[PDB]
Amino acid sequence: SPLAQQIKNIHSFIHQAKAAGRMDEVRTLQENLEQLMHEYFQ
Amino acid sequence: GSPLAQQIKNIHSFIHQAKAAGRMDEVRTLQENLEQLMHEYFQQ
Numbered sequence: 221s222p223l224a225q226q227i228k229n230i231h232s233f234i235h236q237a238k239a240a241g242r243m244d245e246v247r248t249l250q251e252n253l254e255q256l257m258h259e260y261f262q
Numbered sequence: 263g264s265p266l267a268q269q270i271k272n273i274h275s276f277i278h279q280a281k282a283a284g285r286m287d288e289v290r291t292l293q294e295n296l297e298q299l300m301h302e303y304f305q306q
């Protein structure tokens with residue numbers, strides 16, 4: 221699924237942003253994750 | 263889906279419900295739990 225793959229990608233990006241000290245970027249990525257989950261679980 | 267996918271689906275719903283209840287502290291707990299489940303799901 222392209223949705224599943226995007227969710228997987230975002231999981232990794234969240235780790236990368238956290239490791240860089242960019243908790244602001246984590247927040248945006250969590251919003252991206254919500255957009256995808258809302259579609260995937262519909 | 264798998265048990266982890268089903269659990270994740272529930273957490274997605276619970277986050278909306280906690281926001282509606284004004285419980286942003288619960289949202290934080292749930293987002294941490296979501297990460298724990300996703301981490302396990304992708305480790306498999």
Ligand SMILES: [Zn+2]
Nearest residue numbers: 254257258274
């Ligand atoms: Zn949603």
Ligand SMILES: [Zn+2]
Nearest residue numbers: 231297300301
């Ligand atoms: Zn993780």
